[PDB]
Swiss-Prot record:
GO CC, one annotated term: outer membrane-bounded periplasmic space
Protein name: D-galactose/methyl-galactoside binding periplasmic protein MglB
Protein encoded by which gene: mglB
Pfam families, per database record: Peripla_BP_4
Subunit details: The ABC transporter complex is composed of one ATP-binding protein (MglA), two transmembrane proteins (MglC) and a solute-binding protein (MglB).
Residues the entry annotates as binding beta-D-glucose: D14, N91, H152, D154, R158, N211, D236, N256
Protein residues bound to beta-D-galactose: D14, N91, H152, D154, R158, N211, D236, N256
Family of the protein in this entry: Belongs to the bacterial solute-binding protein 2 family.
Protein role: Part of the ABC transporter complex MglABC involved in galactose/methyl galactoside import. In addition, binds D-galactose and D-glucose and plays a role in the chemotaxis towards these two sugars by interacting with the Trg chemoreceptor. Chemotaxis requires MglB, but not MglA or MglC.
Residues the entry annotates as binding Ca(2+): D134, N136, D138, Q140, Q142, E205
CDD domains registered for this protein in UniProt: PBP1_GGBP
SUPFAM superfamilies noted in UniProt: Periplasmic binding protein-like I
Length: 305
């Protein structure tokens, strides 16, 4: 009488989704009646699509899906609809229209813009406290920005809102470079290294990354160039990134709460598999089929708290 739930993780080597993957498996360990069928989609939506077909053929009673491509939500929903199986999307947010296209589709994640606002406020605080960072003394932050996947709601919101928030607080900004490194450490290292090796590299004052993995790559490129005096900011508060906040290699980050996103995803998926209301017997507040888990800013001043 075990209940099977199919789960896809877009890429197991994504630093953040690795934390989430492990947390959801710990949640499942505590539900002796449930079996998770865990899949690594290897950063390929076509691989994920085939994995979902296999999961459905195996009779799973719910799906928890971390999309490779957000725009593929519709495709995945139509697969789930064919079996009348509920689907809890997590971490890559489908459009409102996509969510509303199937009454058994839900989403667990975050308020993406909040992470951009928090990161921007963190940078504003550190900038005001470290006016030595204004290398050219023009009152503006000359920044470079390492973006996540184009079209990913967290990448778009974190990129828009970090700058909006700095500007709203009265801090002018000059974008010297902006490119995607696709959430990846090695790509970010190579991009940052190029920026440090190009003309007017001397003008760069602050590095902004949409996640910690990319921030960490930037930290390594700065080290290679003896330019570690330039501050770097990320998002996620990965343990490895918190170690760099401690050492001073990373100026700040933002907790993306993997534990509670994993728990909400599991709790809702299990309820839906059982034919119950998604939040039954839980304290999750579902707002129009969506659970959002707060972000929290982190730097040396609150690292212990
Ligand atoms: O979808 C995967 C991405 O999700 C974001 O919420 C995290 O901040 C990133 O680290 C991760 O690469
Ligand atoms: Ca400046």
């Amino acid at each position: 009488a075990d209940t099977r739930i199919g789960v896809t993780i877009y890429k197991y080597d994504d630093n953040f989704m690795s934390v989430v993957r492990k947390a959801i498996e710990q949640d499942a360990k505590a539900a002796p009646d449930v079996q998770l069928l865990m899949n690594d989609s290897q950063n390929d939506q076509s691989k994920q699509n085939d994995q979902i077909d296999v999961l459905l053929a195996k009779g799973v009673k719910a799906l928890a899906i971390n999309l490779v491509d957000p725009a593929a939500a519709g495709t995945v929903i139509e697969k789930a609809r064919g079996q009348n199986v509920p689907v809890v999307f997590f971490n890559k947010e489908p459009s409102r229209k996509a969510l509303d296209s199937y009454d058994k589709a839900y989403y667990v994640g975050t308020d993406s813009k909040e992470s951009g606002i928090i990161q921007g406020d963190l940078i504003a605080k550190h900038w005001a406290a470290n006016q030595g960072w204004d290398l050219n003394k023009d009152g503006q932050i000359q920044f470079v920005l390492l973006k996540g996947e184009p079209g990913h709601p967290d990448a778009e919101a974190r990129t828009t809102y970090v700058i909006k928030e700095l500007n709203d607080k009265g801090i002018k900004t000059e974008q010297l470079q902006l490119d995607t490194a696709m959430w990846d450490t090695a790509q970010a290292k190579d991009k940052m290294d190029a920026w440090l090796s190009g003309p007017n590299a001397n003008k760069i004052e602050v590095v902004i990354a949409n996640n910690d993995a990319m921030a960490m790559g930037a930290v390594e490129a700065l080290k290679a160039h003896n330019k570690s005096s330039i501050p770097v900011f990320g998002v996620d508060a990965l343990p490895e990134a918190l170690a760099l906040v401690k050492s001073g290699a990373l100026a700040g980050t933002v907790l993306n709460d993997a534990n509670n996103q994993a728990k909400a995803t599991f709790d809702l998926a299990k309820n839906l598999a059982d034919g119950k209301g998604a939040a039954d017997g839980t304290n999750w507040k579902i707002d129009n089929k969506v659970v959002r888990v707060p972000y929290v800013g982190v730097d040396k001043d609150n690292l212990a708290e």
